[PDB]
Amino acid sequence: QTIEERKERLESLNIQREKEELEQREAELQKVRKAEEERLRQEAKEREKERILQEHEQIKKKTVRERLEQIKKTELGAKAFKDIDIEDLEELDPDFIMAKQVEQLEKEKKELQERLKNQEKKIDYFERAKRLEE
Amino acid sequence: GDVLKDRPQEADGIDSVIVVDNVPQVGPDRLEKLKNVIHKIFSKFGKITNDFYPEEDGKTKGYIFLEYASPAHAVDAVKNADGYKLDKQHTFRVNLFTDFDKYMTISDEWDIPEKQPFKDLGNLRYWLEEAECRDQYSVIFESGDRTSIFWNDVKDPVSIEERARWTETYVRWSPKGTYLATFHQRGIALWGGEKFKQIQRFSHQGVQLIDFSPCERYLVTFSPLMDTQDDPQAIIIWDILTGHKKRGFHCESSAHWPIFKWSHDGKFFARMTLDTLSIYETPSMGLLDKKSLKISGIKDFSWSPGGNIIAFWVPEDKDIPARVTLMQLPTRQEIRVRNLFNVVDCKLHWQKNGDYLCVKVDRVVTNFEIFRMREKQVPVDVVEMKETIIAFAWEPNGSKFAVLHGEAPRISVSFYHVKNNGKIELIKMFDKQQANTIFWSPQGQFVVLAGLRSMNGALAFVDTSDCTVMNIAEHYMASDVEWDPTGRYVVTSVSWWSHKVDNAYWLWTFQGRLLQKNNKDRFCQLLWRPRPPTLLSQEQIKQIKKDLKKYSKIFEQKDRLSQSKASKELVERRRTMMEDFRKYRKMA
Amino acid sequence: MKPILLQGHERSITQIKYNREGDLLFTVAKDPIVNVWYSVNGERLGTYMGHTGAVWCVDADWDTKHVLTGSADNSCRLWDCETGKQLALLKTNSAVRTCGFDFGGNIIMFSTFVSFFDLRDPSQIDNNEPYMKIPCNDSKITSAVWGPLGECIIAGHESGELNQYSAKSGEVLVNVKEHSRQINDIQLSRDMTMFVTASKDNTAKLFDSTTLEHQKTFRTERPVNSAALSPNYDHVVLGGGQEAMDVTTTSTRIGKFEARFFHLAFEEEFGRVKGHFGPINSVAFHPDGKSYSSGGEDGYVRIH
């Protein structure tokens, strides 16, 4: 049974050595997982940063391109709002007072006519005297 | 004859004997000289039959007594011949039988009584009493079809008196409102009063033009129709008050009629006959024995408006400078001679108080000569303008004046003042107007800086205390501009007699704006009748010159109430009817 | 102002209307000759004479170009204003009594029945006949006219009635007894959006067209036959020759028919101007607000 004995161990020997190599074979697949991980993290920072940095510069560039005060706030240079209001004040108040003054003098002629009205009866006395003088 | 006061008989006489003046007197050689010249008196008496020579007690005679073949033909005898051939010193006279103790008839024993007072009461007395304004301007419509005299238009009344054919031809009012004058084929009528009664009428057939003396002694009438009652003439002079004929006068060339110019006070007058002066004293219609008032070789003349001084302008002779003349009215002597060289044309512009005279000198460099007539020795200030002056206007009664110069799109108004310290000043320039005419208010300052503006209202206004534009009238109608005598109305009007874009008269305030218009059918003439100020008391005029404040009473509400009462309800009865009428406007 | 009255006719004027610009007033009359006058200065340009019976009515269009008359002579007439020549002649079966234009000129009213006439200016035809007839309903229509753009028709009636027409259905709506006598004339407002009716029953009224509610009565002591609305002024005119409120009505030599000034919204009489020689038969007002018009038994129109 010596020939019989040798064969059984060989199956055990073959299976175990292969399985241990299979464990080694499994390990190599596992090592690949560690290998994959390294590239991704570096890229993650890089991908975001690379796009952002150009964008950050470009977004600032776009604003800077238009940071020129294209509207220079000196288009006409008057910058007038209260200009229309101030003129309206002097003319309106003066005209009323002046007219009243004007009216007063105008009215005064009637008042002078009242001084004249005493003279007007006096003038009829002159009219009477001249007719009397005859 | 020989006598230094030789005249014939003073009346027509008996019919049976002929009188011959400058006759065939007794004495050798003197007799045959008027043998024919007295056969003038006796030639139309038939054949002269006897012409006995009377001698005045042996002195040389001028007259003889004559008889004819027919005694009663002496009335014929003195008209069909005069001036038959004569020698020595006798010619051209005839009459009838040496009549004497001649007589004349004339109005006497003056008592004014009737017709003295309708004219006077209406204006310058009632006017002063009247408290409204606009100068109580008269009205003329449809070439005299309706003629109206009116009261003040600011108040409810317009029309004071209106009549048909009151003025058949044109219109005229006197300078102080006392009289209104009318023209007609039969003569002139003076009208006056609130009811515009007939004041005086001068019967004068076919009178073509008239004028009135400043002191009302004389009426001046001008006609293209000639009458023969007075010497060969085309002009009658009438006494305006009495209707009496004062004088008649010839006119050689009727170019313009300011022929009898008057003194400032109206006391004396001057008149040109061609290049000769005839002087009629305005008070007496008498000749002035003042030497200058018969002057030879003067060429233009006018009077001071406040000083009675005479002025003459004589254009420059070949070698002697042109010279302006100041002749005083009675003394007749020179107070100032103005000799200037290269003068081209001259116009005389006086100030209303007669304090200053401006001479517009053309040299073209126009020069103004301003004479300080009140300051002693009459120093003359010369204003050298440079740009073709087309108008001058004095401030009435003041020492300021206004001028207009230049091209019509760029016409400049310049206001000037003359000062007590001699130096003249331009107060303000108002450029680029269309003005060519000035109608100042009688009260000062309110100078109407406006052109003709006929159908194209380009009128403007300058006040002169502050050189300020008070108000503008855009009235196309305005062609003439005048201020009221009171100084409270300036009327801008149009004439359908003259043009046809408007036909109306507008009655406005002298402030500077047209208020409203009363239309006139043909607008022959529309004028404010004068309410001219005759006098004033300086003390009453001084300070307030009111009863309290502003004008008269401090309230000054006596007339002011009417605006609010009449508008809501004019008389209550009129109201309820007519209140609906413009309630409708808003609501509907 | 001065009113110029033209009395170029020997028989009664029958209707007046001013045109849009108002320099012409169009009038047709009881004498067989209608007349066209310049309203501005009162010069009479001419007469329209192709009718052979009393022409009861005239109105002038929105363009102020042509005037038309309708008659009891069995005809309806459109007239050339330059020479008065009848250029075409149309027969009608009855008297046309009141006229008033639609705002667009594309339609016209006629009073017979209440007739509706289309004008198809694109077709070079002024129709001889009305385009529609509203037949009578218990009464007879004395007067009728077309409101603005033809939207409503307002008719005054011989029985004192008012009638109302629906443009989209073409017919009459209702009436009410109000007055006792015949409607003599009817003329539209200036914008034609509302209207007044009139009758010889001694009452005058300001009426809403849209609701048929009696809104207002305008009082005179005289039956008013005609009124027109004036552009440039809010006015109503009240009218009689003979006082009309008494039997044996009598006139003065002067001519007691007077122009009466009234408020359109508020209704009061505020004064009068005499001068016409008959009952007012017709009325028109100037587009400037400068005139009013009276139509007399003497045949005259006076524009004031």
DSSP letter, residue C125: B
Contact A111/B129, CB-based, under 8 Å?
A: no
Of the candidates B111, B540, B546, the beta carbon closest to that of A134 is on B111
Q: What is the domain count for chain A?
A: 2
Burial class (CB in 10 A: 0-12, 13-18, 19+), C34: buried
Which subunits have 3 or more CB–CB pairs within 8 Å of chain C? B
Three-state secondary structure along B257-296? CCCEEECCCCCCEEEEECCEEECCECCCCECCCCHHHHCE
DSSP for residue C148: G
> Per the CB < 8 Å rule, is B117 touching A131?
yes
Q: How far is A93 from chain B (nearest CA, A)?
A: 15
Q: Contact B552/A127, CB-based, under 8 Å? A: no
Distance between terminal CA atoms of chain A?
200
Report the amino acid identity of residue C236: V
For an interface test with B, the pick among C220, C268, C269, C272 (most B C-beta atoms closer than 10 Å) comes out as C268
Residue A107 resides in a domain: yes
Query: What per-residue string of b and e applies to A33-63 under the rule 16 or more CB within 10 Å gives b?
Result: eeeeeeeeeeeeeeeeeeeeeeeeeeeeeee
Q: How far, in Å, CA of B23 to CA of B31, rounded?
A: 8
Secondary structure (3-state) at B363 = coil
Which amino acid makes up residue B232?
P
The closest of C211, C169, C223, C15 to C101, measured between CA atoms, is C15
Q: Tokens at residue B241, please?
A: 């008050």
Instruction: Count Cβ atoms below 10 Å from residue A126 Cβ, excluding itself.
Output: 14
Q: Find out whether B159 and B175 touch, Cβ atoms under 8 Å.
A: no
Q: Which residue has the tokens 């006279």?
A: B93
CB contact under 8 A, B546 and A106: no
Q: Could you tell me which chain B residue has the CA closest to the CA of C265?
A: B584
In the 3-class helix/strand/coil scheme, how is B219-271 assigned residue by residue?
EEEEEEEEECCCCCEEEEEECCCCCCEEEECCCCCCCCCCCEEECCCCCCEEE
Shared domain check, A59 and A5: yes
C108-143 as b/e, with b when 16 or more CB fall inside 10 Å? bbbbbbbbbbbbeeeeeebeeebebebeeeeeebbb
Please state how this structure was obtained: cryo-EM
Residue of B nearest to C219 (CA): B577
Compute the C-alpha angle C235/C210/C177, nearest 5°.
90
B185: which 2 tokens? 């084929």
Confirm if B403 and B388 have CB atoms less than 8 A apart. Answer: no
Q: Are residues A96 and A52 in the same domain?
A: no
**B37 within a domain of the structure (yes/no):** yes
Q: State whether residue B76 sits within 8 Å of chain C by CB.
A: no
Question: Phi and psi dihedrals of B264, rounded to 5?
Answer: -60, -40
Closest chain A C-alpha to B110 CA, distance in angstroms: 7
Tell me if B497 sits within 8 A of B143, measured CB to CB.
Answer: yes
For residues B575 and B563, what is the distance between their CA atoms, to the nearest angstrom? 15
Residue showing tokens 């009863």: B547
A62 and A123: one domain?
Answer: no
Helix (H/G/I), strand (E/B), else coil: A131: helix
For residue C231, the chain B residues in CB contact (below 8 A) are none
Tokens of B5: 């006061």
Q: Which two tokens stand for residue A130?
A: 């001249």
Å from B509 to nearest chain A CA?
A: 9
Is B584 within 8 Å of C263 when comparing Cβ atoms?
A: yes
Q: Do the chains contact at A134 and B110, CB–CB below 8 Å?
A: yes
- Per the domain annotation, does B71 fall within a domain? yes
Neighbouring chains of B at 3+ CB pairs within 8 Å? A, C
Separation CA C59–CA C66 (nearest Å): 9
Q: Is residue A74 part of a domain?
A: no
Say if the Cβ atoms of B584 and C266 lie within 8 Å.
yes
Considering the domain architecture, whether residues A60 and A39 belong to the same structural domain is answered as: yes
Structural domain of A125 = 80-134
Is A73 within the bounds of a domain? no
Encoding tokens for residue C288? 């400037």
Q: Which residues of B touch A107 (CB under 8 A)?
A: 550-551, 556
Q: B287, B222 in Cβ contact below 8 A?
A: no
* Resolution at which this structure was determined, Å: 6.0
- Provide Rg for chain C, Cα atoms: 17
The owner of tokens 């018009």 is: C293
Can you list the alpha helix ranges (DSSP code H) found in B295-368? none
Helix, coil or strand: residue C28: strand
Domains: count for chain B: 2
Query: Considering only CB atoms, which chain B residues are within 8 Å of A102?
Result: 470, 511
The residue from A14, A45, A68 where one domain ends is: A68
Tokens of C38: 């310049």
**CA–CA gap between residue A90 and residue A106 (Å, rounded):** 24
Neighbour-count burial of C23, counting CB atoms closer than 10 A to its CB (0-12 exposed, 13-18 middle, 19+ buried): middle
Please name the member of A109, A121, A133 whose beta carbon is closest to the beta carbon of B486.
A109
- Torsion angles phi and psi, residue B263, rounded to 5: -60, 160
- Asked if residue A22 and residue A48 are part of one domain, the reply reads yes
Q: How far apart are CA C292 and CA C3, in angstroms?
A: 9
**How many Cα atoms occupy the beta-carbon half-sphere of B24 within 13 Å?**
21
End-to-end CA distance of chain B: 103
Q: Are B490 and B512 in contact (CB under 8 A)?
A: yes
Rounded to an integer, what distance in angstroms lies between the CA atom of residue B511 and that of residue C190? 42
All residues of chain B having their beta carbon less than 8 Å from the beta carbon of residue A114 are 131, 547, 552
CA B273, distance to chain mean position in Å, is 18
Where do we find the tokens 């003054």? A101
Neighbouring chains to A with at least 3 Cβ pairs closer than 8 Å: B
Shared domain check, A5 and A51 = yes
User: Where a domain ends, among A18, A38, A68?
Assistant: A68
Cα–Cα dist B87/B349, whole Å: 58
Residue C134 distance to chain B (closest CA, Å): 32
Residue A22 CA to residue A32 CA, distance in Å, equals 15
Which amino acid is located at A119 in the chain? Q
Going by C-alpha positions, the residue among B240, B545, B174, B123 that lies closest to residue A124 is B123
- Closest CA relative to residue B506, chosen from B517, B495, B497: B517
One-character DSSP codes across C234-299: -EE----SS--SSSS----TT--EEEEEEETTT--EEEEEEEESS--------TTS---EEE-TT-
Tell me how many degrees the CA angle C27-C29-C32 measures, rounded to the nearest 5: 120
Yes or no: say if C131 and C120 are a contact pair by the CB < 8 Å rule. no
As a residue count, chain A comes to: 134
Contact C289, C230 (CB under 8 A): yes
Q: Which of B73, B81, B74 is nearest to B97 (CA)?
A: B74
Looking at CA atoms only, how far is residue B149 from chain C in angstroms?
A: 21
C-beta separation of B358 from B392 below 8 A = yes
Helices (H), B82-191: 118-122, 126-129
Contact B18, B77 (CB under 8 A): yes
Helix (H) or strand (E) holding B507: strand B504-507
| Strands of the B63-68 sheet, one edge to the other | B18-21, B63-68, B48-50
* Chain-chain contact of B585 with C268 (C-beta, under 8 angstroms): no
Nearest to A127 among B113, B125, B547 (CB): B125
Kind and range of the H or E run holding B68: strand B63-68
Which one of A107, A113, A119, A132 makes the best mutation probe of the B interface by having the most chain B beta carbons within 10 Å?
A: A113
Burial class (CB in 10 A: 0-12, 13-18, 19+), B247: middle
CB B359 within 8 A of CB B369: yes
Tell me the backbone φ, ψ of residue A120, rounded to 5 degrees: -70, -40
Residue A54 is given by DSSP the state H
Dihedral sign, Cα of residue C274, residue C278, residue C279, residue C281: negative
Contact check, Cβ <8 Å, B580/C261: no
Residue C213 CB neighbour total at 10 angstroms: 7
CA distance B64 to B52: 6
Q: Are strands B18-21 and B504-507 parallel, antiparallel or unpaired?
A: unpaired
Chain B residues whose CB is inside 8 A of the A115 CB are 537, 540-541, 545
Report the alpha-carbon distance of residue B352 to residue B347 in Å, rounded. Answer: 16
Q: Are residues A34 and A58 in the same domain?
A: yes
Confirm or reject contact between B575 and chain C (CB < 8 A).
no
Q: Which residues of B touch C206 (CB under 8 A)?
A: none
Cβ of C264 and B577 within 8 Å?
Answer: no
B466 lies within 8 A of chain C by CB: no
- Choose among B65, B60, B77: nearest CA to B8: B65
With beta carbons less than 8 A apart as the criterion, state whether B270 and B310 touch: yes
- Cα dist from B534 to A129, B128, B261, B537, whole Å: 17, 11, 22, 11
Shared domain for A95 and A64, answered yes or no, is: no
User: Same structural domain for residues A1 and A59?
Assistant: yes
What residues in B contact C268, CB-CB < 8 Å? 576-581
Domain containing B580 equals: 540-588
Residues of A in contact with B134 (CB under 8 A): none
Which of A33, A68, A103 is where one domain is finished? A68
Residue A29 CB neighbour total at 10 angstroms: 8
Cα B269 from Cα B259, distance rounded (Å)? 10
- Please state, in angstroms and rounded to a whole number, the distance separating the CA atoms of residues A61 and A50: 16
Closest CA in chain A for residue B547: A111
d(CA A82, CA B256): 62
Please tell me which residue of chain B has the smallest CA distance to C2. Answer: B521
Pair of tokens at residue C265: 């919204």
CB atoms within 10 A of CB B323: 18
From chain C, the residues in CB contact with B585 under 8 A are 234, 265
Q: How many CB pairs below 8 A link B and C?
A: 41
DSSP state of B529: P
Residue among C149, C156, C75, C76 at smallest CA distance from C114: C156
Question: Domain ends where: B88, B105, B122?
Answer: B105
Contact call for residues B375 and B429 (beta carbons, < 8 A): no
> CB of B481 within 8 A of CB of B448?
yes
- Cβ pairs A/B, distance under 8 A: 75
Q: Are C60 and C82 in contact (CB under 8 A)?
A: no
Q: What angle do CA B454, B460, B461 make, to 5 degrees?
A: 135
Distance from CA of B563 to the nearest CA of C (A): 21
Stretch (H or E) spanning A127: helix A83-133
A129 is a domain residue? yes
- Do A119 and A86 reside in the same domain of the chain? yes
**Length reported for chain C:** 304
Are residues C102 and C165 in contact, defined by beta-carbon separation less than 8 angstroms? no
Distances (CA, A) of B194 to B137, B198, B396: 12, 11, 29
What is the C-alpha to C-alpha distance for residues C301 and C304, in angstroms, rounded to an integer?
A: 10
**Strand order from edge to edge, sheet including C257-263:** C235-236, C257-263, C269-276
Quick check: do C and A touch, 3+ CB pairs under 8 A?
A: no
Q: What is the β-pairing status of strands B411-418 and C4-6? A: unpaired
- B130/A113 CB distance under 8 A: yes
Contact B222/B208 with Cβ under 8 angstroms?
yes
Number of CB atoms found within 10 A of residue C252's CB:
7
- Tell me if B576 and C268 make a contact (CB, 8 A cut-off): yes
A38/A91 same-domain check: no
- How many Å separate Cα C267 from the centre of its chain? 21
Give me the half-sphere count of Cα atoms (radius 13 Å) on the Cβ side of residue C164.
12
Question: Tokens at residue A118, please?
Answer: 């005493």
How far is Cα B562 from Cα B155, in angstroms, rounded to an integer? 10
Q: For residue B551, list chain A residues with Cβ-Cβ distance below 8 A.
A: 104, 107-111
Burial class (CB in 10 A: 0-12, 13-18, 19+), B148: buried
Domain boundary among B105, B137, B154: B105
Residue with tokens 């008042």: A111
Question: With 0-12 CB in 10 A as exposed, 13-18 as middle and 19+ as buried, what is B199?
Answer: buried
For residue B372, what are the contacts with CB-CB under 8 A and spacing of at least 6? B356, B378, B379, B380, B381, B418, B422
Q: Which residue has the tokens 């034609």?
A: C192
**Using CB atoms, which residue from B121, B509, B511 is nearest to A127?**
B121
Here the tokens at position B232 are 């060969």
CATH number where B81 lies: 3.30.70.330
Q: With an 8 Å Cβ cutoff, is B110 touching chain C?
A: no
The CATH superfamily label for domain C10-295 reads YVTN repeat-like/Quinoprotein amine dehydrogenase (2.130.10.10)
